Nucleic acid binder design. Structure first.
Lengths: 98, 135, 27, 117, 75, 84, 31, 39, 385
RNA sequence: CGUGCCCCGUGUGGCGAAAGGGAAGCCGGUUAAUAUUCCGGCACCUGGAUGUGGGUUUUGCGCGGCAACGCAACUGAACGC
């Protein structure tokens, strides 16, 4: 269902508010307004664990993307690597309904 | 939502106070003129109380039960939040930007923090807060 | 050695306890 | 005379025989034997040079004072700030995982005793 | 060797117990006066640039310590 | 020019710790205390404890090396061994 | 000892799930 | 005015430590007495 | 006890000591009578009240008839010295507290320089000594040179000129110190958080803000010009660096043995320095004898906030501390520059109230008579003779 | 107290380099013949003893900066990196 994952990621970035990169994701979690977190597979384990701890404190849901950072960036539509990404606004996507 | 509330235990990981357990007293998410970034006014303890045994005198017991605090402005990026919470009635509004700009006021603030944290350590709770971090 | 992981804590009263975060010491 | 000669009885261009040319107040061109350049100390976790610490040869550090050899931080003068931050984060997260695992073990034991009774 | 630019600092250096020698160097080409004191572990030289202050200082110098003017064509 | 090692001279030769004195005299602690009591040998305070011994704590007692030599040359060591 | 004081799934994998993802492997489909 | 004198510094007292050690040793001696058997 | 005596005999280390047996007053210095140095203020004489909050700055006009006070309500106010009358009050930047206020040292021309927030305001006050001729001369002196860059000079708002504010310089950080030059042509600004732009020497004539010293080796606290020479003293948290301006390089560094330097004042002669610091310690430095303190004095139980000399031939200097207290000291420097100055406290001045552990913040001496003015955090100024 | 009890670690020593590693001296002058060695001037390094000043201390072991880090020194045994 990774095809659907990519389709709804493209739709949610086209509709709502999206921030990319570790520093932006961490700032969003600290602000406590982020509604979804995605962590890539090849993300360093300490970085992953810190992000999961932040998300658990902020009660912001987090999902582990199957592919690596380059694949996550390609699916999100930009031409660079993205280890972690945060969705602030869903726009008109059903990504948060589940 | 915002987890960096007033009564919130964290630990400073950069600066002279790296790896030092601290508690927030006042968060400033938007930042002031000085410090144009999200920061927190915090109070921690530099030297933690030392363990006490039955083979040493009462004066030594008291001296190793003493506590020496610090008060600081620190960046959120240089904090790393802890899930734990410390509720202190004495540390309500002890520090502000005026105290951190006036050295006498911050000296009095450290005295107050020392007194209140010594009182809690004597009470005997938050031993995780009062013990040093092993890193 | 292991790092914090949310997969083996998700949708659990243990997760509720961890999110409550009372003072806890492993001795 | 514009040509010089050794003055330390070692005639070979070895790294212990490094020299340079000086012109004396007497108008003569001769050689001064120089020592090796000092190496900056490096971190223990990574190989990056530690800022703030003089780059001297080993025994020279004995004459300089402790504050000139250190940085006022945990693992100061031996590890860099990024590594110290990572160590603090790792220690906290290890303790957190231990607490979570103990909570899970307690819940599993409670489920086992509930099934038994 | 060290440099000094303040007269009372030079005076107390001369008042030091280990103060051994003292000399006056006059440079007329660059109109400078230099007061040199040999004090065991360094030679200290005060730069003056003004003859009135040179007169005052050589008057105020300790009497037991002998001051002398260096001759041209040092032997 | 001899390159002298750091802590091999001075107060290090001047003083000894209690453990070093006992091992040098090859004595039990009760016998060492008997001999010190009888000959009037007492602990002393060097000005620089670390220079005497870099691993010395504030609870370590130091002794005069010449006093330890007097103890070494005392005949009651031989008397004690004969009695044993 | 865990000495304590006296005071919607987060992992939302988009689409039992474990049983239907395990028993639906190649060998089981092949038999 | 400096007055020459002799001073006797504080000795390290082992009284307390010997107290706890003796108490603990007596506790295991009571345990061994309990473990003792008939003759 | 007898067993303990035996154990003391064979176990307690023995030390030989030369016990000190002296009269405690042999350590105490001998001080000449407080009376024998008569010209010195004694008791509070006038109360200056009206500020909503704490007063941060107090200054005397060159003439000797007006007081300028800057306070946290955003207000700078000029007052009649003898009567204590509210003469002019004006609010500069609303919620921004007024950090410092100074007069132009020249007597021929009449300007006020205020520092609140990140702006320096140059003002022409309405006072019963401002003739039309004086007003025009001052306005010309200000408006003489109109014919991220460091410092944006600009004309303030319509209300500002309607009230009497004439010129506004805007810098990167918040100003905490202004020091004029005797000629009045140049004025220096110190902003502690200015990093490399902490110290800036501005020239009013050419309307130019210049950063002369990029590297400072410390956080700037205060600064001043030399009374008789082209030299600039910059006081950081731990040291005071003297810079020659004609060649523009460091000529001297002086080391006050204090953790946090609070203020410093140069002697009118220029060879002596007084340094007050937050560690409750006064330091007199002889700038040609040694870089270490020549004499250190402690008379206060709270941090020293201000030090100030007299510029009128009177041998006097004042020290203000957050104990609500002033110490009036006598300092006489021989005119031969080869003898050691004699330093004698003459009196303790009390009467200021302490609020939030803050006491007196500023001191200024009258140009010709042994009169002083104290600005203190109880919100009040006090004229002492 | 009871003339004992505890830790920790191997190839348990020697030889093998006047080009490998390594603390620190330069200039001017001088002899018939020696000089970075002698004379003159001006320095440096290592080891030791110890005093004065300064630092800390009746908030026990100092302060500042968001940070990189800064300063005249600013408790630290065994054990480990």
């Amino acid at each position: 269902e990774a095809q659907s994952i990519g389709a709804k990621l493209a739709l949610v970035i086209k509709s709502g508010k999206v921030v990319l990169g570790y520093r932006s994701t961490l700032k969003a979690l600290r602000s406590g307004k982020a509604k979804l977190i995605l962590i890539a597979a090849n993300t360093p384990p300490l970085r992953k664990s810190e992000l999961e701890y932040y998300s658990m404190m902020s009660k912001t849901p987090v999902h582990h993307y199957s592919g690596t950072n380059i694949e996550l960036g390609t699916a999100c539509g930009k031409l660079f690597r993205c280890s972690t990404m945060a969705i602030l606004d869903a726009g008109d996507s059903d990504i948060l309904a589940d | 939502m915002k987890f960096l509330k007033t009564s919130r235990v964290c630990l400073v990981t950069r600066g002279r106070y790296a790896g030092k357990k601290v508690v927030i007293i006042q968060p400033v998410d938007q930042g002031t003129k000085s410090h144009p970034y999200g920061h927190a006014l915090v109070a921690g303890i530099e030297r933690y109380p030392s363990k006490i045994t039955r083979r040493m005198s009462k004066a030594r017991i008291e001296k190793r039960s003493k506590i020496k605090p610090f008060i600081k402005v620190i960046n959120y990026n240089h904090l790393m939040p802890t899930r734990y919470t410390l509720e202190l009635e004495g540390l309500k509004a002890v520090i502000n930007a005026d105290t951190f700009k006036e050295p006498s006021q911050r000296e009095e603030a450290k005295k107050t923090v020392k007194k209140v944290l010594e009182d809690r350590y004597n009470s005997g709770k938050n031993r995780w807060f009062f013990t040093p971090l092993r890193f | 050695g292991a790092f914090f992981r949310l997969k083996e804590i998700d949708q659990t009263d243990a997760l509720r306890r961890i999110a409550k975060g009372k003072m806890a010491m492993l001795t | 005379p514009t040509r010089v000669t050794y003055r330390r009885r070692n005639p070979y261009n070895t790294t212990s025989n490094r020299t340079r040319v000086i012109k004396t107040p007497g108008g003569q061109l001769r050689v001064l034997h120089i020592k090796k350049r000092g190496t900056a100390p490096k971190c223990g976790d990574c190989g990056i040079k530690l800022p703030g610490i003089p780059a001297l040869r080993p025994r020279e550090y004995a004459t300089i004072s402790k504050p000139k050899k250190t940085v006022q931080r945990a693992y100061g003068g031996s590890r860099c700030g990024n590594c110290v931050r990572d160590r603090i984060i790792r220690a906290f997260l290890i303790e957190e995982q231990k607490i979570v695992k103990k909570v899970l073990k307690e819940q599993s034991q409670a489920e086992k005793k509930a099934s038994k009774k | 060797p060290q440099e000094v630019s303040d007269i009372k600092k030079f005076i107390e250096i001369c008042r030091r117990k280990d103060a051994s020698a003292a000399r006056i160097k006059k440079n007329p080409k660059t109109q400078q006066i230099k007061f040199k004191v040999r004090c065991q572990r360094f030679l200290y030289t005060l730069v003056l640039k003004d003859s009135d202050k040179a007169e005052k200082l050589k008057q105020s110098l300790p009497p037991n310590l002998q001051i002398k003017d260096v001759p041209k064509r040092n032997k | 020019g001899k390159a002298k090692k750091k802590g091999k001279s001075g107060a290090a030769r001047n003083y000894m710790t209690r453990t070093q004195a006992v091992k040098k005299l090859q004595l039990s602690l009760p016998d060492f205390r008997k001999l010190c009591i009888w000959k009037g040998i007492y602990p002393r305070e060097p000005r620089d404890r670390r220079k005497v011994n870099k691993s010395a704590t504030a609870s370590t007692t130091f002794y005069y090396t010449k006093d330890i030599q007097y103890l070494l040359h005392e005949p009651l060591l031989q008397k004690f061994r004969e009695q044993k | 000892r865990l000495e304590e004081d006296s005071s919607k799934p987060l992992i939302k994998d988009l689409s039992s799930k474990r049983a239907r993802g395990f028993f639906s492997q190649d060998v089981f489909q092949k038999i | 005015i400096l007055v020459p004198e002799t001073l006797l510094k504080k000795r390290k007292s082992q009284e307390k430590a010997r107290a706890e050690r003796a108490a603990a040793l007596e506790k295991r001696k009571q345990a061994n007495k309990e473990k003792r058997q008939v003759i | 006890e007898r067993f303990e005596r035996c154990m003391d005999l064979y176990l307690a280390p023995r030390v030989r000591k030369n016990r000190l047996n002296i009269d405690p007053n042999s350590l105490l210095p001998k001080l000449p009578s407080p009376d024998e140095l008569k010209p010195f203020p004694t008791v509070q004489q006038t109360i200056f009240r009206g500020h909503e909050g704490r007063v941060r700055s107090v200054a005397i006009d060159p003439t000797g008839v007006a007081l300028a006070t800057g306070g946290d309500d955003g207000t700078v106010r000029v007052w009649e010295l003898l009567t204590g009358r509210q003469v002019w009050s004006v609010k500069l930047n609303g919620d921004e507290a007024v950090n410092t206020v100074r007069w132009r040292p020249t007597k021929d021309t009449f300007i006020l320089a205020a520092a609140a927030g990140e702006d320096i305001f140059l003002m022409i006050p309405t006072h019963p000594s401002v003739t039309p001729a004086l007003d025009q001369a001052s306005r010309d002196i200000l408006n003489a040179g109109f014919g991220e860059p460091p410092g944006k000079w600009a004309r303030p708002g319509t209300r500002l000129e309607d009230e009497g504010v004439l010129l506004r310089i805007t810098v990167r950080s918040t100003i905490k110190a202004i020091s004029w030059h005797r000629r009045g042509d140049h004025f220096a600004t110190v902003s502690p958080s200015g990093q490399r732009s902490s110290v800036a020497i501005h020239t009013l004539s050419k309307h130019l803000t210049q950063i002369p010293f990029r590297k400072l080796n410390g956080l700037a606290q205060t600064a001043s010009f030399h009374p008789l020479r082209p030299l600039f003293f910059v006081a950081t948290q731990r040291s005071i660096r003297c810079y020659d301006l004609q060649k523009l390089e460091l000529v001297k560094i002086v080391q006050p043995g204090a953790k946090w330097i609070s203020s410093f004042d140069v002697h009118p002669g220029g060879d002596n320095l007084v340094v007050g610091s937050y560690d409750k310690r006064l330091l007199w430095h002889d700038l040609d004898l040694s870089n270490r303190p020549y004499k250190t004095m402690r008379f206060h139980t709270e941090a020293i906030r201000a030090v100030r000399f007299h510029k009128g031939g009177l041998p006097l200097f004042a020290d203000a501390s957050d104990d609500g207290s002033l110490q009036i000291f006598h300092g006489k420097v021989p005119n031969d520059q080869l003898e050691n100055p004699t330093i004698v406290p003459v009196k303790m001045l009390k009467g200021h109230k302490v609020v939030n552990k803050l006491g007196v913040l500023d001191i200024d001496w009258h140009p010709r008579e042994p009169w002083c003015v104290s600005a203190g955090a109880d919100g009040t100024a006090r004229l002492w003779m």
